[PDB]
Symmetry: D2
Subunit: 462 residues, 4 copies
């Protein structure tokens, strides 16, 4: 017997709040999950189209994955990275030989526990490989929350600072918070994205002038999200190819931060593979294990691997490569390959596109949408004016009243229909589900969006 009133009391009383003050907070307990659904203590089933944080690629509580964890618990236990296990070595091989086997740039994997720890590892390797201090990031990027990963995060609403409750008054960012350069977002400069008559996007051209103003000899790496997860954008098609050609011409590394866009999320194994370019470093988390257990990774190129191999690297993480986490990655990745979830995700994206077309023609509050596989960004506008309700947009902070935030009104409304859908940004949806989400579930979720958008466009909420 679980006493759920008591669980809520303890949860109020003994856990530090994130995003809500204690005063406004209402615990939302989840007793179990499976597939694309969350089950409340009462037995209510909630369709999860945030997919938590787009990190449960394979589906909640996969039967093969759980079984593989249970088998792994017959042997382990725990050993640190200095010891070898079948699970750690198999997971590395699966990534290099099976998943990325058709590309010849990958050299080696390091496993860690979180996407943040992943981005920390890759910034560290990039600076050591080039012997250079500076790393370029882009406006609105999110690469993590930990010190180093946070320095390349350029959302002021996600930097572990503090805001007040429906107020501008009580805000601070963490005091003292660098060896980092902010380049233009892929979505900056558009009136249709502006180019320079050689065809280079103005976001890329001024990224190049920045790197040249500092000196390419000072700059280790450019770190990108192919599509911004928390920041919620899709790039112009030429953007990724152009950042790759630029970085190569400048002798600078390219790190694709694949924590969110990795493992089938975009109808391909990785976000980058949509554009015909290969990176120098990849960071991983989320879909790596489909959140069955905490895991993160970085893959480096042969050349970087060869350089690192020549020295003793004085770096230790206690839980890096934890064998039970690794067995989980093995099973997750094995299910993905044998069940063709990358293709399944691809086909389901195409079904989503066409629902999104139908909704756009019905709802003038949908300013625009794009995405692929199971990653969709939907831009919301005021239907009469065609412009964003919330002026600061991706530069907002959480100090504002949630019932003025369009993605919040939508989420509240969708909920009347057992569906969870919304976004991190105020004017933008970030829709994700499992790669194997069923058609009836997309149908239910799109219908709930339809019902919410009605309410939004009606104005009864102002």
């Amino acid at each position: 017997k679980i006493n759920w009133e008591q669980v809520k009391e303890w949860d109020r009383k003994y856990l530090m709040r994130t995003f809500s003050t204690q005063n406004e907070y209402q615990p939302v307990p989840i007793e179990s999950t499976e597939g694309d659904y969350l089950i409340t203590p009462g037995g209510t089933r909630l369709l999860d189209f945030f997919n938590q944080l787009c990190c449960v690629n394979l589906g909640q509580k996969n039967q093969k994955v759980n079984a593989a964890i249970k088998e792994a618990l017959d042997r382990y236990g725990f050993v640190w990275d200095t010891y070898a296990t079948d699970y750690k070595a198999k997971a590395a091989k699966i990534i290099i030989e099976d998943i990325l086997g058709d590309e010849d740039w990958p050299g080696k994997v390091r496993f860690v526990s979180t996407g943040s720890e992943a981005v920390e590892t890759a910034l560290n390797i990039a600076r050591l490989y080039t012997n250079r201090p500076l790393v370029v990031t882009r406006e609105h990027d999110y690469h993590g929350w930990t010190g180093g990963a946070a320095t390349v995060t350029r959302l002021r609403s996600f930097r572990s600072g503090l805001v007040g409750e429906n107020s501008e008054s009580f805000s601070a960012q963490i005091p003292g918070s660098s060896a980092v350069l902010m380049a233009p977002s892929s979505n900056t400069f558009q009136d249709n994205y502006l180019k320079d008559e050689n065809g280079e996007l103005l976001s890329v051209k001024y990224t190049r002038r920045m790197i040249e103003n500092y000196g390419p000899e000072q700059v280790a790496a450019v770190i990108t999200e192919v599509s911004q997860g928390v920041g919620s954008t899709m790039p112009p098609y030429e953007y990724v190819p152009q950042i790759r050609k630029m970085t190569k011409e400048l002798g600078v590394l390219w790190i694709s931060d694949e924590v969110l866009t990795g493992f089938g999320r975009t109808g391909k194994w990785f976000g980058y593979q949509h554009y015909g370019v290969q990176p120098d470093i990849i960071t991983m988390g989320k879909g790596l294990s489909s959140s069955s257990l905490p895991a993160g990774a970085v893959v480096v190129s042969k050349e970087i691997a060869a350089f690192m191999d020549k020295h003793r690297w004085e770096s230790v993480s206690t839980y890096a490569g934890h064998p039970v986490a690794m067995a989980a990655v093995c099973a997750n990745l094995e299910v993905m390959m044998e069940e063709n979830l990358v293709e399944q995700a691809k086909n389901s994206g195409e079904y989503i596109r066409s629902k999104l077309e139908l909704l756009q023609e019905k709802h003038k509050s949908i300013g625009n949408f794009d995405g692929y596989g199971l990653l969709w960004i939907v831009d919301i506008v005021n239907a009469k004016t065609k412009t964003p309700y919330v002026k600061l947009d991706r530069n907002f902070r959480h100090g504002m009243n949630p019932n003025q935030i369009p993605t919040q009104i939508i989420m509240e409304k969708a909920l009347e229909k057992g569906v969870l859908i919304g976004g991190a940004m105020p004017n933008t949806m970030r829709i994700g589900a499992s790669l194997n989400v069923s058609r009836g579930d997309i149908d239910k979720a799109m219908d709930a969006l339809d019902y919410a958008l009605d309410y939004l466009e009606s104005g009864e909420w102002q």
Copy 2:
């Protein structure tokens, strides 16, 4: 059927090395673990007196922990911090109400995944609460490897930099590795004030005063230095808590290593009659069964954070299956009284170490509590350490010149794993429930290893 020949191949070929070059590296496979033992694929049983990284407090592969986990897998799944679950809520309650119940300073918990992450969170909170930029650390502290945690880590041999193979020439720290003051180690100077204050504390005070207390958020300590391998003078901890209070600065006690029974008490600081403002946790929190880390803050600090919206997310923070593993691990320590058992075993080790120091002039000094012991190693004839740079070394030097490496190699001939990170200093640990027989086996193997050290044949 596991092909271990292959596994080592895949291990050589596709995983990045740490602490070894590719050319020197040889895979050391471990097929399974049980208790205080590790088992090789061929079936050699290795007695683990590292306790990996002093982080398997419960014993390896606890059947009750493993069953509690298997159970949580019937329901889960994954929900991020925004969702409440029984395991996350129970876990916080056990720490606040159950483990820390007789202390009234603690307020709330945040769960994260690793000790480094816990340290990041503590740094953030401290700076946020005080509205101040600077954090004080001490020489030879280890607080983790990620960005923020690294800045307060003062071991040049564990900052994720690069060294060569048996060579002084291929060295580098990470380019651009800043809101952080390094104070002296407790093990410095034992000289005092005549108003009785240790000089190390006095100068730490004088530091905070030179920048100005209004600039300084927090002093972060390890009660006993873990990777750095020290024990303090008894007076160090209370005089820090007092100095920080007087100047209105926070004290974070970094209990990632010393926490959950390691020292014969629930926490390292509990040996010293003081309460911290903030504590960081990992390792023994889940006994490494699954990746978990935590921060406990005071009622004062928690109340303050509670008035604000905190714009921080970590995907895996509060992972319900990790939290189920924490619940069980903690429930086992409480019901088996293992903190008590750690204290009692610690006293047996003290007396065993005495017979060693008596039998071996290369043991310069030792000290510890529960299942954490630092043994200082010296040249039996000169009575000084073998490796001159001591805790300021880097891993560029040849391991056949590092006493603690020589000790491990020899100890291994007895099937025992014992040694340390530091070149002249041992860090000995085992499970809270290590039996008298295993302690005996490890100390015997230590005997044999120091026998080899003192003969100087390794030169």
Copy 3:
């Protein structure tokens, strides 16, 4: 009777080089100066159309300025800024009531010794006033060489690093070199034909991106934007609407505007200060060069009444030994008293108009002159390959000094002009930075332009290759 050969040995032997290796170094001694001329020990008279560093506004060795200095020496000696003197008090008053008397935003002045120290001061003041850490600068700005001033300098060719002798393998910046944001230059985001791009709302994309940058970090994090009205060392002229758009953007974002007026200040641009061409007023001005026309070392910062009242409420724990030096102050008094009464600002205006019509003619004649713009005694000329119509030096303002001077058009031009006894050129590889005294003659202008003609002839024969 000076031994100038020994002066040459000693200069070679005991002075640290700047911009040259010891081996390539050939000292150029100057025995004296007068007006717009430099005079060698042997008696070569060199027409100085660099005006040294756009810093000798009044002219070299003005007799009244030097006589005022000589007079000051019957009294001083030295006192530090804790004592008041007539000279310091007059200087501040001339700046506030007389020069800036038509504008009502100005509050107080603090004097220092250099333009760098002036920028340091301003940066300190803005951050204290706002209680915010970040300062926004621009691409290719130069704001000085000292610690803080350097951080807002975005020229990798002038951040006090080291390059090689016709090589970039020796090449290093100062290790370490930080609460600064780099905004796009006024001159970034122009098409292949030179039009600056605009919002369709009319806002220059450069300003639009600057705003976006500020809102990304949060305006509560940002103290000030520091600008040059006209980039001096970087050698640019803005679109007319840039200066007004930045003032309006800073106002809206609650951020300060610092006009770095060290080079463009005091007549340089045919008005008292650069910003007065643009119908806006800054929060803080930094000053130097033309403040004393280099007669003695002198820097300054002017701050608004609001900033002044706030700083007045507090004890400021800042000391600089030489700040306010009475003899340097007396030099500013005389310098400024001459500029006012000889109408040198109005004079500067009129000369520039004449220069414009000279360079118009030089452009019609020389296809290597891609473009030019300036005002008063500050002019920029972009140089191109007459044939390809692009600049010869592809890295442009992101170059460093490791490259071979005989491939730098601005070096070749300078060489050739020296054949006509004329000193002219630029710090940037593709762009000339022309300045003389505010009172230069028509003939000395004609003499400079003719040499530029001659130089451009040689540039176009390509024989320098």
Copy 4:
């Protein structure tokens, strides 16, 4: 005919305040200066035992230095650093061959306008030469107010921050105020504690700090041989041990001689009391005896050679200012010719003995030390034998000056005609011209005697 009533109004109204709020401030004008005297508008003669800022070594308005300037003004005008002048060349030559001519380490000079600009330069050169980022400084050092020079200043009362007026409420340092490590002050750990090997614990801890970071990370240690603003004297072994330590660690030593340079201490330079030689010297103050603003840096032959192989991309407009250099030459030619260093040693040995007597006569002098025309005097409470102002060199100017012993001595001294006192609250920093007369030294020393009389009676409380 100057209207000094107008000079005051304009001074109050148009000058930014330092150290004083607009409300409390009252202008102290100085109409002329001569030798060791300052002259007010009304004709009052103030004997200056601060020597302004220990920066007018030669004496105020030296008639020879002043005439040299006038001569230079017959020819200049202004040239920047790329053009060679007789004055700039002679000044560097005087410094290297005549002044430092008995030590064979000094290589090249760069002239700048201020002491801070001189420190900036040194830091830049040290980091470039070693290709290392970190500079070690010491608790209570003062090395300037400009960006880089401020990073190595460790006195919170001099970091260009703001405090309130008799109040703890309105204080702030600059947002942003970093590649610098602060090592213990020479005067930390006191008899100063030593190593079992004789090494001072302050030096021992500096070494372990550099070793903790890695000597391969550390460009240089910058010191004041004797702390100026900070107001201290080192134990005799400190300077030699820091010199030995830096060499042992492959690390540069910057002697900041901005204050202690050019005779101040009864030798040419502060370090020269100690039998060692720095890798770099920074200079200001005594360089021109403040006749016109100058600063300079002197580097070793090794450092010079490395610099000479490169094009250095550094420009300072007034660096090398030709009139500033003619001021410098004449200043140095007078110092060498009047044997000012030797004169200074001698007046130092006279002052030592005057202070001794003052110490016998006054229990509030806890301690004194110095040399030449630089003397530090530790002011203590006669009853407890401890300092009046507990935060001592870690204070800030937010406190009421009527409670600062150095403010009290000052105002009572001003009653006898003599400006004497110091920057630190419990420490006097006494300086005069190198050619200060015996009569003036006697007069100042009486004035201190009179002042300490008032301090010790405690009517000020």
